[PDB]
Design an enzyme around this catalytic site. Structure first.
Site, mmCIF file in Angstrom:
data_model
loop_
_atom_site.group_PDB
_atom_site.id
_atom_site.type_symbol
_atom_site.label_atom_id
_atom_site.label_comp_id
_atom_site.label_asym_id
_atom_site.label_seq_id
_atom_site.Cartn_x
_atom_site.Cartn_y
_atom_site.Cartn_z
ATOM 1 N N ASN A 247 2.168 -5.254 -3.090
ATOM 2 C CA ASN A 247 0.787 -5.635 -2.821
ATOM 3 C C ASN A 247 -0.019 -4.355 -2.569
ATOM 4 O O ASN A 247 0.477 -3.446 -1.912
ATOM 5 C CB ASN A 247 0.768 -6.613 -1.624
ATOM 6 C CG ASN A 247 -0.585 -7.202 -1.328
ATOM 7 O OD1 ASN A 247 -1.156 -7.899 -2.182
ATOM 8 N ND2 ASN A 247 -1.110 -6.979 -0.111
ATOM 9 N N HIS B 12 -10.279 -6.434 -2.303
ATOM 10 C CA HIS B 12 -11.365 -6.204 -1.348
ATOM 11 C C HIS B 12 -12.480 -5.503 -2.088
ATOM 12 O O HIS B 12 -12.435 -4.275 -2.229
ATOM 13 C CB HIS B 12 -10.881 -5.318 -0.186
ATOM 14 C CG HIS B 12 -9.867 -6.013 0.637
ATOM 15 N ND1 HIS B 12 -10.187 -7.136 1.398
ATOM 16 C CD2 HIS B 12 -8.548 -5.765 0.816
ATOM 17 C CE1 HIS B 12 -9.090 -7.563 2.006
ATOM 18 N NE2 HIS B 12 -8.057 -6.751 1.653
ATOM 19 N N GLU C 298 -6.088 -11.056 -1.242
ATOM 20 C CA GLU C 298 -6.893 -10.837 -0.033
ATOM 21 C C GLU C 298 -8.380 -10.750 -0.383
ATOM 22 O O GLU C 298 -9.110 -9.925 0.140
ATOM 23 C CB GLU C 298 -6.476 -9.516 0.647
ATOM 24 C CG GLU C 298 -4.971 -9.396 0.821
ATOM 25 C CD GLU C 298 -4.503 -8.188 1.619
ATOM 26 O OE1 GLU C 298 -5.379 -7.398 2.107
ATOM 27 O OE2 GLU C 298 -3.261 -8.048 1.756
ATOM 28 N N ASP D 78 -12.079 -10.630 -0.760
ATOM 29 C CA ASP D 78 -13.353 -10.801 -0.071
ATOM 30 C C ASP D 78 -14.319 -9.814 -0.708
ATOM 31 O O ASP D 78 -13.872 -8.911 -1.419
ATOM 32 C CB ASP D 78 -13.209 -10.629 1.468
ATOM 33 C CG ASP D 78 -12.597 -9.310 1.940
ATOM 34 O OD1 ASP D 78 -12.528 -8.325 1.150
ATOM 35 O OD2 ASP D 78 -12.167 -9.285 3.122
ATOM 36 N N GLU E 210 0.827 -1.202 0.000
ATOM 37 C CA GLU E 210 0.000 0.000 0.000
ATOM 38 C C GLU E 210 0.874 1.271 0.000
ATOM 39 O O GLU E 210 0.666 2.178 0.829
ATOM 40 C CB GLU E 210 -0.923 -0.023 1.231
ATOM 41 C CG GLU E 210 -1.855 -1.246 1.233
ATOM 42 C CD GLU E 210 -2.801 -1.291 2.419
ATOM 43 O OE1 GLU E 210 -2.764 -0.326 3.270
ATOM 44 O OE2 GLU E 210 -3.533 -2.313 2.559
#
Ligand SMILES: *[C@@H]1O[C@H](CO)[C@@H](O)[C@H](O)[C@H]1NC(C)=O
Length: 319
Positions: free
Chosen positions: A172, A208, A238, A240, A131
């Site tokens: 990432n 996400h 990640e 979801d 990030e």
């Protein structure tokens, strides 16, 4: 037979799940996490971050990370190791410290070399830098950026590569899965590391997403290929898909379609090595206060029972 077997048949290395140490005393949870028909890979959700691994300066703490590695190892699952340099979940000694370029570089490198050496040989991939970008494609004004400048990023990669020459090194980030200033900036970070001469093997796309607002299979695939074109592998790291509450049959169905397109995008892209969901049961999903009003983000519900999204994933993996 499950997500991981289906993924591997299509040429992915894994389908996997994150977990966290508080969950591991639940033997029913652990039995499904350890089901390698569904999960061939594990990420530690918290126990390899800087706050966990160097909570006071030079004081390395690996027990909780090692426990996750040991579980993966017993099960024959790969590890993704997460994450070395990040502005969040940083101990106050780093974020509040009085640094110069030399002194913060020494402390950042010390962190990387100690953590990566400890886990040498155990990890398929490291998220080396997490990030680093703001939403508008600027560098985040983290302690690393303010003190060291952009070089902190290639230096972190070079340092990780020196400690463990073979693990795949990933940048990432989230909101880089659709086109825009941020994804463009993430491409430019890839090119910048490579131009510096440091090793970068992969881009991690956190994924996400939100039910009903997830990028199309076509948009996602296009964007993945924008990264692979730069000479990196990609993975969804990640995944979801949180839904606006309350849950309804229509939202569960949409959620299934959304997950299906994410799986299908990866399967469609040469160089997409795998998908990791951010835990697998809603009971342990990541829904912090900023997303109040959202929830039920995962393919199993809070009772460890499959939701329609599980079948969506299977369909997207071609099973
Ligand atoms: C910090 O040191 C690195 C390593 O030499 C260099 O690339 C970078 O420009 C320096 N940054 C500052 C702000 O001095």
């Amino acid at each position: 037979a499950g997500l991981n077997t289906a993924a591997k048949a299509k040429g992915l290395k894994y389908f996997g799940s994150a977990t966290d140490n508080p969950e591991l005393t639940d033997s029913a949870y652990v039995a499904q996490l350890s089901n390698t028909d569904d999960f061939g890979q594990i990420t530690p959700g918290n126990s390899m971050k800087w706050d966990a691994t160097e909570p006071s300066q030079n004081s390395f703490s690996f027990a909780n990370g090692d426990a996750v590695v040991n579980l993966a190892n017993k099960n024959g699952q790969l590890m993704r190791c997460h994450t070395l340099v990040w502005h969040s979940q940083l101990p106050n000694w780093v974020s509040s410290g009085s640094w110069t370029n030399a002194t913060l570089l020494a402390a950042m490198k010390n962190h990387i070399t100690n953590v990566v050496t400890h886990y040498k040989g155990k990890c398929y991939a490291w998220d080396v830098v997490n990030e680093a970008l703001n939403e508008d494609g600027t560098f985040r004004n983290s302690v690393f950026y303010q003190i060291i400048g952009p070089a902190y990023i290639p230096i972190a990669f070079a340092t990780a590569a020196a400690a463990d020459p073979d693990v795949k090194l990933y940048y990432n980030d989230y909101n880089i899965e659709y086109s825009g200033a941020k994804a463009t900036a993430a491409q430019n970070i890839v090119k910048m590391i490579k131009a510096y001469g440091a090793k970068i093997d992969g881009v991690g796309l956190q994924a996400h997403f939100i039910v009903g607002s997830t990028p199309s299979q076509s948009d996602l695939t296009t964007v993945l290929k924008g990264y692979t074109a730069l000479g990196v592998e990609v993975a969804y790291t990640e995944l979801d898909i949180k839904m606006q509450l309350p849950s309804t049959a229509a939202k569960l169905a949409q959620q299934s379609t959304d997950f299906q397109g994410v799986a299908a995008a990866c399967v469609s892209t040469t160089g997409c090595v795998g998908v990791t969901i951010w835990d697998w049961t809603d009971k342990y999903s990541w829904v912090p206060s900023v997303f109040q009003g959202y929830g039920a983000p995962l393919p199993w519900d809070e009772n460890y029972v499959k939701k329609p999204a599980y079948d969506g994933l299977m369909a997207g993996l071609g099973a």
